[PDB]
Amino acid sequence: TTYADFIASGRTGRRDAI
Amino acid sequence: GHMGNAAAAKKGSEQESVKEFLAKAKEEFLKKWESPSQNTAQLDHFDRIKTLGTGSFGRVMLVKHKETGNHYAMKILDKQKVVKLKQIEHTLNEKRILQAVNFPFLVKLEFSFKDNSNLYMVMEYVPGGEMFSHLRRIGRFSEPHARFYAAQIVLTFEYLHSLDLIYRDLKPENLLIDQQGYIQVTDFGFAKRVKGRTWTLCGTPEYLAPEIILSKGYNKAVDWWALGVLIYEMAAGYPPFFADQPIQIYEKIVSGKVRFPSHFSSDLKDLLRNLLQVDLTKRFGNLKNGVNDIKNHKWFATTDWIAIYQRKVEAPFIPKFKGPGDTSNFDDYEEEEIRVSINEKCGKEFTEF
Ligand SMILES: O=S(=O)(c1cccc2cnccc12)N1CCCNCC1
Ligand SMILES: *[C@@H]1OC[C@@H](O)[C@@H](O)[C@H]1O
């Protein structure tokens, strides 16, 4: 699923600025 | 047309009254900008309770004012670290903005001061924690729940943009929930006075507008793009563009393609397609009608904008609050000490703080 792909991306915790 | 006489007259008068409000708000902001407040407390006026947030930006501590007993969130910055990381202008600008603005969804700076080692910003304590935590816990917000939050962001950006301030730091990580369930915006390190264009590469990959990625001179419409990303993430539980690594995210952003969960309403998708619009000549918030294209969109048809501003709408969710000084909605951290030093550090650079 799209949600599954999200989890697998790993970018699911707090995100840093560039 | 879409509106009868009574509805059109009411909306026209409402839009004129917003203009009148914003003109007065801008005059008040500019007076405070020119005459900033300074050195309005000292460290021994507070008890240190717990660390609420720690990072490259320094740290934020829950404190208790000794005299009055009120709790606050105190942001502490190490002057020497700020200098090393080349953040003098952003630090001074953030404090100058916070002391000059006034809006019900912008955090209030109550005190600021400095000592040999550190700078201190003492802000109202917002006990509900980050939207990010609640969103990941619940998974996703229903459309009415997401709309309640989105309306507050629309009004806050309408206010900031009327002061010619670009925001650039929107994301669930940077939105707090207060005791009444309303939003507080706190971080102003990327905010800037921008009447035309600006050029700095700053933000968070998932929330970057295409024109920032593509190294253009851009304007305040990047905030409306970022609102689209926020509404999407609130309503889906994940953002519209994600990938293992930022480069792949940027490829999706600039592509002009976005896909939606099948549970999104048609009204929501239409609004998002007009906010997540790669073409600036077509993006909502950047057109002749300005913010009214957003406020008058069908997805916001049930939104009473004045009632949201007056905080008279019952919030969809009220965070757990077992009394003042409750920190259950924040993370736990190792309590590093607040060391001051016998020698002043970086007095020249921070003279205006
Ligand atoms: O929650 S904070 O520590 C915080 C900051 C400012 C005022 C605050 C007031 N109350 C609680 C937490 C507060 N935070 C730090 C950076 C991350 N983005 C959200 C703001
Ligand atoms: C999303 O949350 C952050 C991290 O735990 C990751 O593996 C995903 O579960």
3-state secondary structure chain B: CCCCHHHHHHHHHHHHHHHHHHHHHHHHHHHHHHCCCCCCCCHHHEEEEEEEEEECCEEEEEEEECCCCCEEEEEEEEHHHHHHCCCHHHHHHHHHHHHHCCCCCECCEEEEEECCCEEEEEEECCCCCEHHHHHHHHCCCCHHHHHHHHHHHHHHHHHHHHCCEECCCCCHHHEEECCCCCEEECCCCCCEECCCCECCCCCCHHHCCHHHHCCCCECCHHHHHHHHHHHHHHHHCCCCCCCCCHHHHHHHHHCCCCCCCCCCCHHHHHHHHHHCCCCCCCCCCCCCCCCHHHHCCHHHCCCCHHHHHCCCCCCCCCCCCCCCCCCCCCCCCCCCCCCCCCCCCCCCCCCCC
Cα separation of B118 and B345, whole Å?
8
CA distances from residue B193 to B33, B73, B94, B178 in whole angstroms, order as listed: 11, 26, 11, 27
Cα separation of B21 and B158, whole Å?
11
Number of the ligand closest to the Cα of B242: 2
Domains held by chain B: number: 2
Method of determination? X-ray
Amino acid at B190: F
Resolution in Å, one decimal place: 1.8
> Quick one: B24 and B147 in the same domain?
yes
Please give the DSSP secondary-structure letter assigned to residue A10: -
Cα separation of B96 and B37, whole Å?
8
> Quick one: B138 and B286 in the same domain?
yes
> Quick one: B150 and B286 in the same domain?
yes
- Residue whose pair of structure tokens reads 């929107």 in the numeric block: B170
For ligand 1, atom 13: residue with the closest CA: B73
Cα separation of B280 and B221, whole Å?
8
> Quick one: B247 and B327 in the same domain?
no
* B13 contact partners, CB below 8 Å, separation of at least 6: none
> Quick one: B145 and B164 in the same domain?
yes
Provide the number of CB pairs (under 8 Å) joining chain A to chain B.
38
H or E, element range at A2: helix A2-9
Q: Is B239 exposed, middle or buried (0-12, 13-18, 19+ CB in 10 A)?
A: buried
Amino acid at B157: F
Nearest CA in chain B to A12: B238
DSSP 3-state of A17 = coil
Which CATH number fits the domain that encloses residue B344?
Answer: 3.30.200.20
Number of the ligand closest to the Cα of B330: 1
Q: B62 is in which domain, residue-wise?
A: 36-129+321-351
Q: Does B202 touch chain A (CB under 8 A)?
A: yes
Q: Point out which residues pair with B59 in neighbouring strands.
A: B54, B76
CA distances from residue B214 to B190, B194, B243 in whole angstroms, order as listed: 18, 19, 18
Asked if residue B3 belongs to a domain, the reply is no
* B337 contact partners, CB below 8 Å, separation of at least 6: none
Active site residue B169: yes
Instruction: Please count the residues of chain A.
Output: 18
DSSP 3-state of A12 = coil
Asked if residue B27 belongs to a domain, the reply is yes
CA distances from residue B192 to B89, B142, B173, B292, B306 in whole angstroms, order as listed: 11, 33, 20, 23, 27
Determine contact, residues B233/B170, Cβ cutoff 8 Å.
no
Asked if residue B71 belongs to a domain, the reply is yes
CB half-sphere exposure, B337, CA atoms < 13 A? 3
> Quick one: B203 and B329 in the same domain?
no
Which has the closest alpha carbon to B61: B139, B142, B147, B120? Answer: B120
> Quick one: B196 and B330 in the same domain?
no
B151 is written with which tokens?
Answer: 């309306």
Q: Point out which residues pair with B64 in neighbouring strands.
A: B47, B71
Cα separation of B284 and B221, whole Å?
8
